[PDB]
Amino acid sequence: TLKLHDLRPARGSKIARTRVGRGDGSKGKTAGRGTKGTRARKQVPVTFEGGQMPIHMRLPKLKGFRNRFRTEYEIVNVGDINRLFPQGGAVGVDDLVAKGAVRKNALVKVLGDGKLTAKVDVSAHKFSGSARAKITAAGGSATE
Amino acid sequence: ARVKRAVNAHKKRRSILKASRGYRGQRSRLYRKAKEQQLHSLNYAYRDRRARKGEFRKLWIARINAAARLNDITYNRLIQGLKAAGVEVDRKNLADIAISDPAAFTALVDVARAALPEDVNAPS
Amino acid sequence: LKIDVKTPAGKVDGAIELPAELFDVPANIALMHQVVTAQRAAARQGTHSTKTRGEVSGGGRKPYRQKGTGRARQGSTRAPQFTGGGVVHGPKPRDYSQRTPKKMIAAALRGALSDRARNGRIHAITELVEGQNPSTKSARAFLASLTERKQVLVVIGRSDEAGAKSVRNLPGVHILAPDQLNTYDVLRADDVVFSVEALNAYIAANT
Amino acid sequence: PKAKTHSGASKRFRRTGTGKIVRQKANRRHLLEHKPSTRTRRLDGRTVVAANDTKRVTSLLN
RNA sequence: UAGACGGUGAGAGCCCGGUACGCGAAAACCCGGCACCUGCCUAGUAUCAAUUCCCGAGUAGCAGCGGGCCCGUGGAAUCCGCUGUGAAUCCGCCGGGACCACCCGGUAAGCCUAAAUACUCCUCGAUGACCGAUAGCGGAUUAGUACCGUGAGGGAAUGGUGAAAAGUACCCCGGGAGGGGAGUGAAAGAGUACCUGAAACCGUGUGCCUACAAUCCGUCAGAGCCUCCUUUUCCUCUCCGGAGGAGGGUGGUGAUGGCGUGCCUUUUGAAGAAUGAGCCUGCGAGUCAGGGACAUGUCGCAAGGUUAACCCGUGUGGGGUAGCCGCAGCGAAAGCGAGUCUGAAUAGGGCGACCCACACGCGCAUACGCGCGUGUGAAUAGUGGCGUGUUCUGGACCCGAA
RNA sequence: AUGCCGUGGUGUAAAGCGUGGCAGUGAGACGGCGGGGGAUAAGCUCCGUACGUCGAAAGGGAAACAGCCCAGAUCGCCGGC
RNA sequence: CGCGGCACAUCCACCUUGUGGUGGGUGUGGGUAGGGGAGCGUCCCUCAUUCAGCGAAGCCACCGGGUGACCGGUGGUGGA
Ligand SMILES: [Mg+2]
Ligand SMILES: [Mg+2]
Ligand SMILES: [Mg+2]
Ligand SMILES: [Mg+2]
Ligand SMILES: [Mg+2]
Ligand SMILES: [Mg+2]
Ligand SMILES: [Mg+2]
Ligand SMILES: [Mg+2]
Ligand SMILES: [Mg+2]
Ligand SMILES: [Mg+2]
Ligand SMILES: [Mg+2]
Ligand SMILES: [Mg+2]
Ligand SMILES: [Mg+2]
Ligand SMILES: [Mg+2]
Ligand SMILES: [Mg+2]
Ligand SMILES: [Mg+2]
Ligand SMILES: [Mg+2]
Ligand SMILES: [Mg+2]
Ligand SMILES: [Mg+2]
Ligand SMILES: [Mg+2]
Ligand SMILES: [Mg+2]
Ligand SMILES: [Mg+2]
Ligand SMILES: [Mg+2]
Ligand SMILES: [Mg+2]
Ligand SMILES: [Mg+2]
Ligand SMILES: [Mg+2]
Ligand SMILES: [Mg+2]
Ligand SMILES: [Mg+2]
Ligand SMILES: [Mg+2]
Ligand SMILES: [Mg+2]
Ligand SMILES: [Mg+2]
Ligand SMILES: [Mg+2]
Ligand SMILES: [Mg+2]
Ligand SMILES: [Mg+2]
Ligand SMILES: [Mg+2]
Ligand SMILES: [Mg+2]
Ligand SMILES: [Mg+2]
Ligand SMILES: [Mg+2]
Ligand SMILES: [Mg+2]
Ligand SMILES: [Mg+2]
Ligand SMILES: [Mg+2]
Ligand SMILES: [Mg+2]
Ligand SMILES: [Mg+2]
Ligand SMILES: [Mg+2]
Ligand SMILES: [Mg+2]
Ligand SMILES: [Mg+2]
Ligand SMILES: [Mg+2]
Ligand SMILES: [Mg+2]
Ligand SMILES: [Mg+2]
Ligand SMILES: [Mg+2]
Ligand SMILES: [Mg+2]
Ligand SMILES: [Mg+2]
Ligand SMILES: [Mg+2]
Ligand SMILES: [Mg+2]
Ligand SMILES: [Mg+2]
Ligand SMILES: [Mg+2]
Ligand SMILES: [Mg+2]
Ligand SMILES: [Mg+2]
Ligand SMILES: [Mg+2]
Ligand SMILES: [Mg+2]
Ligand SMILES: [Mg+2]
Ligand SMILES: [Mg+2]
Ligand SMILES: [Mg+2]
Ligand SMILES: [Mg+2]
Ligand SMILES: [Mg+2]
DSSP states (O other), rough: OOHHHHHHOOOOOOOOOOSSSSTTTTOOTTTTTOOSSSSHSSSTTTTBBBBOOOOOHHSOOOOOOOTOOOOOOEEEEEEEEEEETTTOOETTTTTTHOOOOOOOOTTEEEOOOSOEEEEOOEEOOSSOOTHHHHHHTOHHHHHH | OOOOOHHHHHHHHHHHHHTTTTOOTTTOOOOHHHHHHHHHHHHHHHHHHHHHTSSSSHHHHHHHHHHTTTTOOHHHHHHHHHHHHHHHOHHHHHHHHHHHHOOHHHHHHHHHHSSSSSSTTTTT | OOOOEOTTTSSEEEEEEEOHHHHOOOOHHHHHHHHHHHHHHOOOOOOOOOOOOTTSOOOOOOOOOOSSSSSOOOOOOTTTTSSSSOTTTOOOOOOOOOOOOHHHHHHHHHHHHHHTTTTTOEEESSSSSSSSSOOOHHHHHHHHOOSSOOOEEEEEEETTHHHGGGSSTTTTTTEEEEEGGHHHHHOSSSEEEEEEEHHHHHHHHHH | OOOOOTTTTTOEEOOTTTTTTOOSSSSSSSOSSSSSSTTTTSSSSEEEEETTTTTHHHOOOO
């Protein structure tokens, strides 16, 4: 019978705690600092390179603008329609969420990477150019 | 959990003060001045466990040299004479024969003298 | 895998089948330890506190002049190097609770009950006392005909109030509902006694 | 609370698909008459941050 | 249905107060039910017409200077304040980030609205991997007292006999204070200076060394005394024991010989005539919060992992899919997508994707392979807990100014 | 003359290189050699040097003596060179 | 250099032929700032087990022990 005095964690899960500043036999008086300067009593910021112009102000900005109205399509490849649906049938935006190939409540989009051999009848948003070539060659149909 | 320190802290204070019984002044009475003295005593001991191997050897040579010159040989030629004769008696015992049994030290001189080169200043 | 249900002052009145995916799981020791630790840490009340140098009463002014005295310069009378000063890095009120996932809690529980079912330590009863008024002397005698050990877990339903009252003040008997089974209370007890209405509720809630 | 990302570094760096950090190049915003076009073409595009700045740029971008 | 907690001459469910569980309210107050009482309604409704009147004024709009919004006057809308100008009542008017046109939403300048939320001087009931007299409140004790300051204000120190006071009757030295003998008690090795009674510091007794020697005060070599134990042949008082002596061995001392420049911080370098410390006991410095950030150890599940607020439970347990990270990238972006941006390019490059160690058929080639079907079933991978190292925001390792 | 870059042999465990976690240091001193500033003065000042020791190195020698000569303390020994 | 103890690294043979021990060569082990690894001691809580008015803790003395922080035994005082 397992009791509570038989429970012990895995080897290496729980290491001890080096308490700094407790004697010369361990990390001693200066507690891993050694200095007499700013590093001895404070924290030097990352954004400060000594007084020269830093890396976040020498360099120019990245060009352009973010689009405020960018629609984003979640992506399923037709090489995963073959692997997840190996007997064909109707493929929809709702059947791809349950099979784990795409997220909820987003606009799906079938791309064309991989090998498709099943006769699938897929109904997505905004098919690719090479997706329509690989689905109709297997006898299927690609409807919006 | 607030921890009092005195049961832990007295363990090393009773070890220094028992190691310091026999020190005059404040060095048997006070923990701060008797820990300083234990740092020097255990260095002087380490320094002198290694130095007393060359103090007793410095005492044995002074007695081998003292008992060589009663048998009109020097220490300089007694040790040359005992390597050519193949006697590997160390200097602890070669200086203990000279006190305990002085008639067996004259015989070791006669072996060291006879097994020595005839002209000691000649090129070998 | 098969458990015979016992009656008070009587004999067997059936058999309850323990399913294998719920009572025959290999015991993961390094998983039961994280779930026990995450339960006892959620029982720390955490109410412990001290005062820092800005909450100890007084200590606003600089106490005397800095130069010319030959004393050290001291800043405030409630500094932590003083007697009566604030505590530096002292305890504050904490919430020592952890966030163990659901699939690790419910797997350490099944591992704890599997090690009971594998050693012949799971029992099943129809009730504890046959009547409706409680009686400890009859419920103590019936838990001694089952087991002879010191720590007994009794898992009975929430609606059976007449049997919960019979085993409240016994030394070494812990009482909980079927929907309150946890790893610490199962591993503490040498023996685990399910009511037959309570054993069919733990199984049915886990298919 | 919650860590704030440096607003000047999030406008001057970005990440690729495998975790490299890219940036643009200086000496190209103005004074462009005397510069031969083999120099303003060397300053075109984007480069990977050097291996000696890649630690500090990471702690700004996170 | 009582094994919660405490008290009693030491660990009490069965000795006491109580606990589980039940009963109990003259009167006063609060809550609720019903009467009395108080108030409202008992004339409009439906259809048609589209001419008229009304739909909150020094208000909205506009302009000047400001305030606040992610928005620091900017192309600057929405909202609010002062000055000037100053409308219209539905074909009216405001808003949808300058503005115009169409369209969609809405009726400003009058007022009142419970619940969800914030807090605890104070009242009851509970609790603590919180403190236990330098701690916990400043305050267990005359405590905001004594004391300091003209004032506003500052602001302490002090707990423990014993189970029971049984608190030492009586005699003795003494002016008393205090003690000795008796007596109490299990114990005065508990005596109102009181449980345990450490260290600094101060005496008394005793063993050894010390008054011709220049000493970081110790260390190694080392004689002589002193003490206490025992092989060893006597004393055979002899059964003994030590009576003594020779020998060995513990503990104390240390004549005398060598070596030896205190601890700490700071420094190129200190025994330093650089800095800090009179001594002892007590206290006094990398802590904690966050689904934070980067990296790693380990555990769970795995193309998935995980919930947050909240709801339900005597709990640490059971529900909860909103969200987050992974799932395909490139580009300033529209976009296109195993590719994509630059370009006139089927040029080259940037970023990204892409497995022959193995048999096959196979256009071919000395071979290895270039290519393609299928396994020999190429080896992948993320996420969420918990440890640790760093780091960010906060007082952030502690102490210290003018 | 040395020093430097390349290459082929031979020798050498704790050499090197890439990529991440955590650093500390960024006031040096003296002696050898080669030079500038100084009066070829300085325990002067500023350089160079797969040069040294100190820093951070105790032990032995130089009477004493961070830096000079010999030599790198794992611990024990009343052993030898 | 000789003779014994300890530790680290690597090599070479075994055992569950690395989750690790045993055995044998060779090499190594001064050290500040600092990095990494492995531990002693004190206090609180849970689980198990065992001592305690036939004397616990705390204290003092003595005799021992371990590679270090330190630990054990006997006795004295003490009273949970
Ligand atoms: Mg120190
Ligand atoms: Mg520094
Ligand atoms: Mg400095
Ligand atoms: Mg300092
Ligand atoms: Mg400047
Ligand atoms: Mg002495
Ligand atoms: Mg020697
Ligand atoms: Mg204040
Ligand atoms: Mg101040
Ligand atoms: Mg306080
Ligand atoms: Mg939960
Ligand atoms: Mg431009
Ligand atoms: Mg040009
Ligand atoms: Mg009790
Ligand atoms: Mg009683
Ligand atoms: Mg403004
Ligand atoms: Mg608009
Ligand atoms: Mg209105
Ligand atoms: Mg209106
Ligand atoms: Mg209102
Ligand atoms: Mg309200
Ligand atoms: Mg309340
Ligand atoms: Mg209260
Ligand atoms: Mg107090
Ligand atoms: Mg006390
Ligand atoms: Mg007054
Ligand atoms: Mg008297
Ligand atoms: Mg008396
Ligand atoms: Mg008596
Ligand atoms: Mg007593
Ligand atoms: Mg007193
Ligand atoms: Mg007393
Ligand atoms: Mg004399
Ligand atoms: Mg002299
Ligand atoms: Mg001397
Ligand atoms: Mg100086
Ligand atoms: Mg001094
Ligand atoms: Mg002096
Ligand atoms: Mg100074
Ligand atoms: Mg001083
Ligand atoms: Mg992008
Ligand atoms: Mg171009
Ligand atoms: Mg390309
Ligand atoms: Mg993982
Ligand atoms: Mg590195
Ligand atoms: Mg500098
Ligand atoms: Mg410099
Ligand atoms: Mg220099
Ligand atoms: Mg010169
Ligand atoms: Mg100089
Ligand atoms: Mg230094
Ligand atoms: Mg030296
Ligand atoms: Mg060196
Ligand atoms: Mg020297
Ligand atoms: Mg000398
Ligand atoms: Mg010689
Ligand atoms: Mg060495
Ligand atoms: Mg070392
Ligand atoms: Mg160090
Ligand atoms: Mg007694
Ligand atoms: Mg006794
Ligand atoms: Mg205790
Ligand atoms: Mg002891
Ligand atoms: Mg004892
Ligand atoms: Mg005792």
